[PDB]
Design a protein around this nucleic acid. Sequence first.
RNA 1: UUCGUUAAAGA
RNA 2: GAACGAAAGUCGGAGGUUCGAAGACGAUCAGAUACCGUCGUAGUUCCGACCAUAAACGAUGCCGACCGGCGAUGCGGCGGCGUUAUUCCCAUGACCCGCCGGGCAGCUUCCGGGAAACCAAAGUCUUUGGGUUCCGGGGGGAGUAUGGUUGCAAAGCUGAAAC
Lengths: 81, 215, 222, 125, 55, 97, 25, 129
Amino acid sequence: MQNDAGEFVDLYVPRKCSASNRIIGAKDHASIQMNVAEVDKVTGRFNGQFKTYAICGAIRRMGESDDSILRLAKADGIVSK
Amino acid sequence: LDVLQMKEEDVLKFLAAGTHLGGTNLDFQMEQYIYKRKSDGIYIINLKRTWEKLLLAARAIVAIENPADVSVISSRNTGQRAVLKFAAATGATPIAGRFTPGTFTNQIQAAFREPRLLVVTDPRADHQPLTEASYVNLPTIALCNTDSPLRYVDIAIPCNNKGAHSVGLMWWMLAREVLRMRGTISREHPWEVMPDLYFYRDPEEIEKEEQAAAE
Amino acid sequence: DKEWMPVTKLGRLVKDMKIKSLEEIYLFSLPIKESEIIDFFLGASLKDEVLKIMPVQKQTRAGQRTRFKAFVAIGDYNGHVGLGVKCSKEVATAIRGAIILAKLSIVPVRRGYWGNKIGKPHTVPCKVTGRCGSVLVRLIPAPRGTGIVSAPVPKKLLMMAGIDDCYTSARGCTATLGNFAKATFDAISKTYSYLTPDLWKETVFTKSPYQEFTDHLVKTHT
Amino acid sequence: GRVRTKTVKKAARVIIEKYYTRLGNDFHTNKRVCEEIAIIPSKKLRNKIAGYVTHLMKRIQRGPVRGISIKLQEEERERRDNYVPEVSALDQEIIEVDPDTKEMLKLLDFGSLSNLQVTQPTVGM
Amino acid sequence: YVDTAVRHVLLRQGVLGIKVKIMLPWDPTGKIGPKKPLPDHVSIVEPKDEILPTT
Amino acid sequence: TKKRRNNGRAKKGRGHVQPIRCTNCARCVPKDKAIKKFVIRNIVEAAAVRDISEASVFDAYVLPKLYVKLHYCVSCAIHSKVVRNRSREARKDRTPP
Amino acid sequence: MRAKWRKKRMRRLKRKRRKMRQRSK
Amino acid sequence: VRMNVLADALKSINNAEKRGKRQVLIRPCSKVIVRFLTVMMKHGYIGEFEIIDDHRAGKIVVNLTGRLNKCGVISPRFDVQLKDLEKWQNNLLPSRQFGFIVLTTSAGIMDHEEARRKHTGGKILGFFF
RNA sequence: UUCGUUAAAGA
RNA sequence: GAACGAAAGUCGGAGGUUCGAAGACGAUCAGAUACCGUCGUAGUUCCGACCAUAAACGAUGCCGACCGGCGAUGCGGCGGCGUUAUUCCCAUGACCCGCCGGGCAGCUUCCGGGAAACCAAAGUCUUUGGGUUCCGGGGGGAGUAUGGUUGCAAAGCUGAAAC
Ligand SMILES: [Mg+2]
Ligand SMILES: [Mg+2]
Ligand SMILES: [Mg+2]
Ligand SMILES: [Mg+2]
Ligand SMILES: [Mg+2]
Ligand SMILES: [Mg+2]
Ligand SMILES: [Mg+2]
Ligand SMILES: [Mg+2]
Ligand SMILES: [Mg+2]
Ligand SMILES: [Mg+2]
Ligand SMILES: [Mg+2]
Ligand SMILES: [Mg+2]
Ligand SMILES: [Mg+2]
Ligand SMILES: [Zn+2]
């Protein structure tokens, strides 16, 4: 949140979900920050570089997370062709 | 990619354990994992989309920093044998038997952990860690079947968790890929022991019978 | 002057001085368990008030058995308030239990403007609602210097929340404080849960404190 | 009559958990062993604890106990774990299951070594 | 085990009966507590056996 | 409030069910509501089967039966030890073994 | 007293008052 | 039977937003609906949308964002004069800075922000935020 | 198989 | 405004087995005229006319759209070198698997509602508006009196006020 002076007045910018683009609440204890790391070339070396997939509570309870992780990583190109 | 592809030894071990066959009932989120129905009720799960979820489960487990932050839970005896030899081998903390519900919730009990990742065997037999995930904020990897619910589940690996050989093959090959990602075993190196430890052992009737037949 | 008795790993990060602010905990929505954590992060959050201590009964063969149900609303005036409900057979025991449960149930309060972006936010960002029982509480943004036109209990709760100007609309049994104060609590808790039009872009996705200071947690656990 | 208190059974389980090799199958010896290794003032409580200790000894001599296991039974379970033969890890290289997985091996590129031709009716369930 | 005192307090409303009972801790060596252990409490020892079997 | 979803009987599509008389109290109850069981009794008590088999003309060439549509109501069946009361979680059950 | 028999006795009282009106119009 | 097809579309939009889906199937088509979704596109609450041109009546599929809170149709389409929009501002929009109301101006389907610059006013289709 | 009724408050 | 409208009841014609309002007795109780037993009138039966009420219940208005799943069932339609039925390839029959449409329904669920019971509707409701009809304004008085209207009658519709 900005004013006319242009200052950052907001306390914290919460996690927007990667499934349904919904704001994860501060008391939403059913949320998760999935973490999947990158894989190197033919030699197959582990990297410290990783990508974070925020999945919120109602998606996790309805079960849309299982389809959502694969349909999000398919746009990345890391799960399949 | 190009090294994470399945090979002939891998598909020979999958068809030997018989993980291509599943249950008879369907689920509304297993349609993308099933391939085609078959007569006599038993349905067919494809192998490539199982290998990809095994790969993502291995990526999730190797993405941890403290190996004590990964808990492995199974309540049925077809998985309790595999958990103790799985998690004590490479990178996790095992617990089996009775779950003692309320384990990850209250802090008056000395049996309290803060896992940053969870791998369970059967969701229907392990509904209680799925319930307690909502207070600890942990991900969940589950060896699911064609008739298992997918509440509080992040990675679902479609399989048959009834037969012990498929369960032991999946724990074996999951630890195999975890160790090849961590760097203990190279890619052009087979595993040193045959996984029956991970599968099952029938107790002392036919075990001592086979021992007396071998001696 | 007592030892914190290291447990639960979040306060162990706090005593290892790895989480600089409670805003960093509310970014990731980690479950707070002990009440010493926000006492360590906030020293001026001791401003509280007991709202109503009412007796409840349990009919037994020997007679009616009483126990007192205490309500305590806590909060610093910067926008971090909480509510606590505790029933116990002793007065001061129920009061201390409600204080500790309010320290547990503290939430952040989002503050917005009436429509002119000068500075020092004084109101809720939009018209939000809260429901507990049949009690529908609607919080509506107000102009600058308007005040809190409400019942005295959520007036004190919003005065602790820092919402200096607000309009309220209550439907239902407003007479029951155990539902009306919790409906006001839900209404001020949904302020961050509302999808607001200054959060368009994808967030930074900063690292977890567990990932950032795993090795300190390893050397303090083993 | 032997519907013993939880503290009595808990003390006897602590005895049989800590010290097993000092105990035998005789009551008059096991009572003196338990009073050498523990402190019980009441002689009736001595007899009660020692009787349940002899009962646990007669249970362990027959089979395992779900409540507690000794280090020797733990080593026997570890032996039954790591006793690893090589008989049924991988079978012979003749495996036939399904025409559906035959079509899987035809479409998705793999070996498809053995023959696959079986016909089944629709009498499932 | 339980020191029990029953005393009176004379106030303007009348008399007030106070009953204070305190259970004593078990101290075998010293005059702080009694020397008799509790009949419900069973005392055990630490494990003793160690290394060096045959050869 | 409503104690059950079925409201006692099984009338859901139709609007009227012809009543059938009870056995003990002889009260007209609709047949989707009355306790309608099918008792299958041997006509001979099991200790007299041996007596009639020893005193029979044929060498065990007849075995008669008795099939009766027993038709109680819910007012008399609870008194007559059939449809005893259960729990709220126990009202969602099926036929007993 | 049941509402059924209360309504029936008020109905009988209505019939009695109607016969009273017909007797003395 | 079949009337207020813009409300018939926005009920499906609302239930798909509350469920958390990706795209909606909408069986009617109106120029009202196309210009309404065009205003929503121009504000950026929804995304790209494709209209299967059936010979009888097409089908609109809208790629959602996960962004909408509430969208609906005021039923009788009230005739709103200027210096009376502030009642609907205080009644419908959750704040002063947020949300918009689709006015049916004489020069076309316009917006709450566009109407005070065009100086036309008119009827109201609905609101969205 | 038959077996009716016990005012008003006052915790 | 109009057509049907259970049972009971009313007016004619026919008959009358069982049950049976009222009624007469026999019992138990302090007392029964009641629950129990015996007999039995109107009725319960059919064809003509009237009455229009019920816990007439899904205690839940009608039409349209959306929003999870599972296994079955009733009726059509479609697909499946499967099995069993005539004489035989050619058509219908019975069983097994799946889909479609509307129908009575069942189980789980944090989809959401509601005070809860509970509900795939009682959801899409303070983030309040798809179209439309009838009804509630604390409880009694009271669905009562007086009006009006329909009916052979019992009665039905509309319907207060004082307190
Ligand atoms: Mg009140
Ligand atoms: Mg009742
Ligand atoms: Mg009916
Ligand atoms: Mg009397
Ligand atoms: Mg009739
Ligand atoms: Mg006649
Ligand atoms: Mg009689
Ligand atoms: Mg008779
Ligand atoms: Mg008569
Ligand atoms: Mg009526
Ligand atoms: Mg109607
Ligand atoms: Mg059919
Ligand atoms: Mg045909
Ligand atoms: Zn009966």
